[PDB]
Design a protein around this ligand. Structure first.
Ligand code: NAP
Ligand code: FOL
Length: 159
């Protein structure tokens, strides 16, 4: 079982040149609880963004180039990424855009945070046709003193 997890603003924006213009510590907590003790596959740019291995997770990094950090596992293909996760109940694909695009057709679950933020970015979560996906969980949150925007956690499972 392969799952994708992603935080989407408007227009499914997930990434931009600079740090996202928001502070969403609840979404970070959601990402951690949904990824903890699972293998995480990410692309090299997301690996760079994160800065260090996600603790408590087997970290698998996709790059066409040789790896540059022996703390994590580097693979050169989608299939090698999956294989490098081993035999687990659930692989979490944590982005970014090129990685999500390649893993979405493989995935059985999506964990999406829909953030009510108007941002320009160069990177978008893929179109998922909702005839393919059933929303099994939905939880909306207003912005508050810790969270700059309203956001909604959703889990979809593939039909
Ligand atoms: N014109 C564009 O918009 C464009 C096009 C490409 C990239 N970018 C820039 O990259 C940033 C974020 O991109 P992202 O979120 O898409 O990054 P991402 O998915 O986190 O990382 C992408 C990197 O992962 C590796 N990768 C992904 N799939 C692979 C595969 N099947 N086999 C081998 N390696 C694989 C490649 O690493 P290596 O590079 O080490 O091979 C690729 O460059 C953006 O700020 C964006 O501007 C932009
Ligand atoms: N829902 C969701 N929110 C996200 O921010 C998110 N981010 C990514 C990719 N980028 C990142 C960047 C940093 C960390 C990160 O450092 N998380 C730490 C908590 C430490 C912190 O507070 O920064 C973790 O342990 O998961 C994770 C993913 C992928 N899916 C997402 N999914």
């Amino acid at each position: 079982m392969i799952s994708l997890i992603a935080a989407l603003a408007v227009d499914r924006v997930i990434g931009m040149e600079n740090a996202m213009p928001w502070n969403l510590p609840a979404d970070l907590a959601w990402f951690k609880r949904n990824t903890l003790n699972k293998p995480v596959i990410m692309g090299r740019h997301t690996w760079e963004s994160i800065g260090r291995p996600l603790p408590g997770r087997k970290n698998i990094i996709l790059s066409s180039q040789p790896g540059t950090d022996d703390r994590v596992t580097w693979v050169k293909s989608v299939d090698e990424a999956i294989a490098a996760c081993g035999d687990v109940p659930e692989i979490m694909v944590i982005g970014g855009g090129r990685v999500y695009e390649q893993f979405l057709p493989k995935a059985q679950k999506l964990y999406l945070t829909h953030i009510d933020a108007e941002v320009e970015g160069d990177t978008h979560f893929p179109d998922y046709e909702p005839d393919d996906w059933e929303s099994v969980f939905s939880e909306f949150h207003d912005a508050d003193a810790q969270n700059s925007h309203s956001y909604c956690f959703e889990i979809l499972e593939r039909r």
